[model samples]
Target: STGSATTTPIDSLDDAYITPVQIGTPAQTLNLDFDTGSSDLWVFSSETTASEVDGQTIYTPSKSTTAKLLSGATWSISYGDGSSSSGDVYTDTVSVGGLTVTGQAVESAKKVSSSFTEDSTIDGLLGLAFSTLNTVSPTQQKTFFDNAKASLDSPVFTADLGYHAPGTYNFGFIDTTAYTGSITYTAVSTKQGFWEWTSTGYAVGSGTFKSTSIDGIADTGTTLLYLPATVVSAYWAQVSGAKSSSSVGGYVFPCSATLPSFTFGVGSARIVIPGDYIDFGPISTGSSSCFGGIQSSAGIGINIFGDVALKAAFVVFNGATTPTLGFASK
Candidate 1:
C-alpha cells in the first residue's frame, strides 16, 4: 500500500529531519534519519554499549517474535561527517509510513562513535541511496525500498524539506501540491552507488551563467552544500567581508554582509539558492561573524547538495530507469 509520513526537525541542530519507523512484530519504534547518501538501516539497540546509549530509544529484537538473526552477518557504516556505527544483523518486519516490508535487514549497533552517540535524538540511519551500497557483510542486503518497490504503486518517494517546519516524505506516489511550477527533470547515474548528476551551468549571484561541469549528489543526510573550491571561492568573493576562517574550518563573513543568490543549471532549468539561507547562522552566538552554508568539496571529492540547498525547492527522487531528479520551487 502507498503511504507517506511527516518528518520533524531536530531542535537546535536544524540540519536534519527524522521520521519514526517501526521494526519487528510488536514494532519497536525508532527515530531514524532518512539518508540518501548511504544505504544501510542501522539503529541504536539493546546491543549498544550502555555508555553509548544516551537519550535515544533502542530497538529490542528479543521483544519481537519475528526477529531472526542473520547468521554470521554484520554491518558497518560511516558518514561524511565522521559519524559511524556497526553491529550484527537481524531480519525483521520493518514498517515505514504505514507500509511494511518483511525480512528487512536491520543492523543493530553494538558500537557507535562519539558523533553518533552524542546526537541522542538520532537513533539510527535509514539509508535510501541504493542496494549496492548496503553494508551487510558477506552478502550485501537489499534496502527497504528495494524489497518494497515491487509492491508500490510507483516505486518512488518525494522529499519536501522545509526551513524550520515539518516536511512530508511521500512513498509510492508524488504529491503535486507540495511543489509549484514545473519539475525540471534530469538524468542520474547510479554507477557510483549514489544519485549522481552533473550541472549544465553555474552562476555566482545574478552574474552571467557560465557553462561548466559540476558533478554532485543530492544528499539529505548532509547539512551544508559543498561545491568545488573554484565555485566556492567565486561565491564568497561577492560578499564584501567574507573570508576563510581557519578556526571555523570554512568561510565566514560579517553578520551584516549582504549576500548574493547562487544559481546552478539542471537540464534547461535554473535552480537558485537564496543568499539569506547561505548565511548558515552565526559562527558563534556572541560573535558578529557568520559561517557559510556553501564550502569546498575538496576532501569529500564529490559536491553535495545538502539541506541548505535542498530546502529552497521541492525534490522528486524518481526510482526508475535513468532515475530522473525533478526539481521545482517551493
Candidate 2:
C-alpha cells in the first residue's frame, strides 16, 4: 500500500509544514506538523486544559468508537527550542492521505507549552522518525510510519519541501517527476534516532568545493540550516555587511546585501541552495538588518540540514533494513 499527502508551509517564512491527518472512526481531520526529528504521534485533545488550548483543533477520543485507552501508558516530549508537551495514550484508527493504520498509538496531549499554544497553525505533530525515539513510557509504541512501512510497496518515503509553496510527502514509491537529475544515495546512521548522514563538503557560490566531511541530519521539523562555525563563516564572508551578532542572536546583515548560494555534496552529486533562501527575512518588523537561514551549529553540537536546505532538493528517507538517504536536484 502507498499514500500521498500535501504539506504546506505555515507561513511565508516556511517556519513549519502542516499536513491533514484523519483520526478515529468518523475521521476527525486535524492539521498536524509532520516532524522527522522526533518520534511520537501526539495531538491536542479533549483532555487538554482550557488554559492551554488556543484556536487549534482538538481530538476527542471519547467520541470515537474505535478509540481505546492504553491504560498505563503516558508520554512527554521536549523539543530543542524548550517547548514541551505531555499526554496520555490511546489506540485508534489513524489515516494519512489514504493510507490507514489500525491501533495507531495517538498520544492525547493534556498539557502543552506556551509556544505550541500560541501557534494556531498546527494542531499537533506526527513524528516520522524511528520508533526507538518514541517517548511513550511503560510500553513504547510504534510511529505511524513504523506500523505502516511493512505494507508499503518499497518501504520508503520522500519529502519534497517547498519555498513559500505547497510540497508533497509520498510513501511506498518515489515520484521521479518531483526531482531532476539522478539521485545520489548515501549511508544513514539510525543509531542517533535521526536520518543522519555525512556530506562530502560544501562550497560558496562559484567557489571551489571544500574537501571535508560534515555529519548532519535531515530534519524537517527545524526551520534553518546549521553547519560548523567555520563553514558558516565562509558563506557569510561572501556577503557584504554581514556580521555575527550576540544581540541579534545569530548572523545578520544589511537587507540590501547580495548573498551567495550554498552548495553541499552528496557523494558526487551537488545540491545548490539559492541565495534568496539564505536571506531569512528581516531581523525585526521594519528593520533593515536581516537574519540568515544558515547559522553555526556549534552550540547544538550536531549540524542540521533543516527546511532551508531540504527545500532546495527532493529528499528520500529509505527505511530498508540497512537504511540510506537519497538526494536529488529539483
Candidate 3:
C-alpha cells in the first residue's frame, strides 16, 4: 500500500517543509522535517538536556510499549548549516502517512545545537536518504522509506513541495495528476550519499542556455538553491540594485527589482524556475530588501538544488537498482 502525507511550511520562512509522523504504541504525533540530504531518524526526547532543548516535544520511550533499546548504540550528526544532534537509539513502531513499519530504529536526542533549539516547531528529522548514510554506530540504520520500500507496489516516492502552502509527499506510487509534462529521468550518483547529478548548465529567463556542466545535489532539507559564485554573479547582474550583502549573508536585491527566470538543465529536460520564485521574500515586511533564493555555494564547492528548485518541479525518487531522479513541470 502506498502512503501520502502533507508537507507544511515552517512559519513564513518557507525554508523548511515538515510532515506529521506517529511513533510508539499509542502513536505520539510529531512534525518532522523529511530531509533528503542526510540519513538519521532522530527526535527531541526526554533524554535531551532540558537546557539544550527549547519548547520541542520530546519522545518518551518508556511510554511506548513497543520501544526497545539498541544497547550501547548512539548517533551523532552535524549538518552543513552547523546544526547538530546526538542521541541513543531505540526501535519502535513508526508510522508515516497511513503506512506503518515495525522495529524502526528511532534516535532519541540527548544533545542538540542552538539551531535545533531555536527552531522549536520541528520535533525531529525523518531522513529520506540512503541507509548507507545513517549515523548509527556498530550497525547502520535504514530510513523509513527504505524499510517500507519492499512493501510498496512500485518502490518509488514523489516529493511535491509547495511555496507558502502545504504540499504532499507520496510514497510507493506516482500521481499523474500532480505534474503537467513528461517526466525527465536522470541517473543519480550516490557515491557521496546524495542525489547527485550533472546539471546541463543554466539560463536566465529566455537567455541562451550555457553548455557548462554544474554538479548539483537535490536536497529537500536545504532552503535555497546554491550555485557557483560565478553563476550567482551572472544572474544578479540582470537585476538592478542586487548585491552580495555581508549583513544578509547572501545576495539581496531591491524588492522591486525585476528578476529573470532561472533554468537548470537535465539532459533533454530544462527545469525552468520562475523569476518570481527567486525573490524569496522581503528581509522584513514593507522593506525594500529581499533575499535571492539563489545563493553562492562558493565555500561548499557543490551546487545544491534545494527547495527553490524542487518546488518548481514534481520530483520522483526511485530506489530501484541504479537509482535515478525524475523531474516534471508542476
- Report the number of the highest-TM-score candidate: 2
Q: Please state the error at residue 211 of candidate 1 in Å.
A: 2.2
Model 1, 193: alpha-carbon shift in Å? 0.2
Off by over 4 Å in 2: none
Candidate 3 RMSD to the real structure: 1.3
Tens-place lDDT per residue, model 1, 1-330, is 787888888864467889999898788889999988899999999999999988999999999999999999999887887778899999999998998999999999999999888887898999989889999999899888888888989888788887777888888987888888889888888998988888887898879998988889988888888999999999999999899888889999998988899988888888898887787777877888988988999988799988887778888888875587888887
TM-score of 1: 0.96
Better of 1 and 2 by TM-score: 2
Model 2, range 1-330, lDDT digits (tens) per residue?
Answer: 999999999998898999999999899999999988999999999999889999999999999999999999999999977999999999999999898999999999999999999999899999988999999999999999999999999999899999889999998899989999999999999998999999999999999999899999999999999999999999999998999999998999999988889999999899999998887889989999999999999889889999999999999999999999999999
lDDT of 2 at 261: 93
The model with the greater lDDT, 1 or 3, is 3
| Candidate 2 lDDT for residue 284 | 85
C-alpha TM-scores of all predictions: 0.96, 0.99, 0.97
lDDT of 3 by residue, 5-104 (tens): 9999997768798899999989988899999898899999989989988888889999999999999889999999989999899999998899888989
Per-candidate clashes come to 0, 0, 0
* Residue 310's lDDT in candidate 3: 93
Q: What ordering of candidates by TM-score runs from best to worst?
A: 2, 3, 1
State in Å the error of residue 33, model 2. 0.9
- C-alpha lDDT of residue 52 in model 1: 92
Q: Which residue pairs of candidate 1 clash?
A: none
